[PDB]
Predict the structure of Apoptosis regulator Bcl-X.
Amino acid sequence: SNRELVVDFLSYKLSQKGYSWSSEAVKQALREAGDEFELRYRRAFSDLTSQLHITPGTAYQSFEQVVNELFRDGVNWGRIVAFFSFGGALCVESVDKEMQVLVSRIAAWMATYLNDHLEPWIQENGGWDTFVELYGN
Ligand SMILES: CN(C)CC[C@H](CSc1ccccc1)Nc1ccc(S(=O)(=O)NC(=O)c2ccc(N3CCN(Cc4ccccc4-c4ccc(Cl)cc4)CC3)cc2)cc1[N+](=O)[O-]
Ligand SMILES: [Cl-]
């Protein structure tokens, strides 16, 4: 379910680049918000991308550093969307550098963070149905 959302979002962003991974309302609303975040914040996106030096020995560190930064002042739906776009960017970028092996690992790190750290805020703020209600269509 957190798993499901992650795989869905990551599969989508990978597919938009021509790569193959290899609640529908929640899933669509999340993809759509990701597309829109990535355009509105395309400068922040490219600042990030051009400063990730991905290696497998630093990838977790890079993920954690950015995710800690992202939620440092609190959690809101927009930041949750940005969290998924970041993981998408990380995956796309790993494939570019021929570190395809990291994709499955990035998905695991993402689900764990959701499960451990984002879940209490999500449940307290109406769950994903409330996300859909506020930012769907
Ligand atoms: C009906 N529908 C068409 C309406 C669409 C509107 C506008 S689109 C959008 C804007 C921001 C985030 C997500 C989507 N939706 C919306 C509007 C507002 C909100 S919100 O109030 O809950 N949140 C925000 O407005 C918000 C949240 C985060 C945010 N960031 C901008 C800068 N980045 C940079 C950054 C800083 C620290 C660490 C990492 C990053 C970062 C993360 C990912 C990447 Cl790829 C690059 C850099 C972080 C988050 C900007 C705005 C959420 C949402 N929403 O979740 O859908
Ligand atoms: Cl906080």
Q: What stands out?
A: Residues 1-137 form a domain with the Apoptosis Regulator Bcl-x fold (CATH 1.10.437.10). The helical segments are 2-16, 24-40, 42-49, 59-71, 77-96, 102-124, 127-135.
